[PDB]
Amino acid sequence: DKWEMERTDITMKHKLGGGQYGEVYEGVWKKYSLTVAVKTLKMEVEEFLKEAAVMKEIKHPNLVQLLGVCTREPPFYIITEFMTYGNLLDYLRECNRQEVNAVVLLYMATQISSAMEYLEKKNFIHRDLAARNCLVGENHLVKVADFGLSRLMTGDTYTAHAGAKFPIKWTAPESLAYNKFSIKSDVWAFGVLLWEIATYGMSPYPGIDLSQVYELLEKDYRMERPEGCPEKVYELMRACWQWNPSDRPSFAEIHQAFETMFQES
């Protein structure tokens, strides 16, 4: 299609993110002197190509934009825009908090919830929402990584494969116990993502043993309000962490609430 590209069009450079994202490289699109992110294969081939095909249908200012693909012959490339400031987790931990202050945190949360509202409306789920999977550009622009998206008609449930291992401290209770994922489990992870943002990148449930997280959640244990976090933001967190998925707000409601708060600041 129009996305296909010749691998010669790209000159590879350093592997990025310390390898934590797999085979992803900083690259140059020589035609436009553009620094890009190149993703290569070295997961199964068919899942790689599906994840490229899904990104062709994705267009939102806060979702990482696909730019091209090399799918005809190996090695296969997925080429996306390059976000200058890396992932949101490292960005928050290393930032100047006088610059990245409370209103900027609200701005970043409004952007992320806008991307998730779009996915909610387009019948997609993310399944790995976390600060490490958000990217930061110039002027506190935030985009959600959209490489593990799955199709799921909003309101249905996806059952992860047997033996799947999850980031426990970001994972909804129905997913920990029954491997069931939905847009509501993305809302749960967003609440944890909210907590990461309000703490400038602290690890959630600090010091708590991973084996006991689920049993704590069963007895209505939830993370405490971070220092300096507005109560209205913390109550949005707690709504995302409701035990019953149907009681969690939609991303549309979440984005509306953040849009209102952001405009009032």
The experimental method behind these coordinates is: X-ray
Distance CA 92, CA 197 (A): 7
Query: Is 130 within 8 Å of 196 (Cβ atoms)?
Result: yes
- Among the listed residues 9, 90, 128, 186, the single catalytic one is 128
Name all domains of the chain by residue range, CATH numbers in brackets. 7-81 (3.30.200.20), 88-263 (1.10.510.10)
What is the DSSP secondary-structure string of 157-216?
-EEPPTT----GGG--HHHHHH-EE-HHHHHHHHHHHHHHHHTTSPPSSTT--GGGHHHH
196 is in an annotated binding site: no
Residue 146 among the catalytic residues? no
222: tokens are: 């939830």
Q: Are 197 and 131 in contact (CB under 8 A)?
A: yes
Beta bridge partners of 151: 124
In units of Å, what resolution does this entry have?
2.3
Residue 105: its H or E element? helix 102-121
Q: Please tell me whether 39 is known to bind a ligand.
A: yes
Could you tell me the two tokens for 254? 């979440």
Whether residue 32 is annotated as binding a ligand: the answer is no
**Whole-angstrom distance, CA of residue 206 vs CA of residue 41:** 35
Cis peptide before 61 (omega within 30 of 0): no
Residue matched to tokens 């602290």 = 202
Q: Contact at 8 Å (CB) between 6 and 71?
A: no
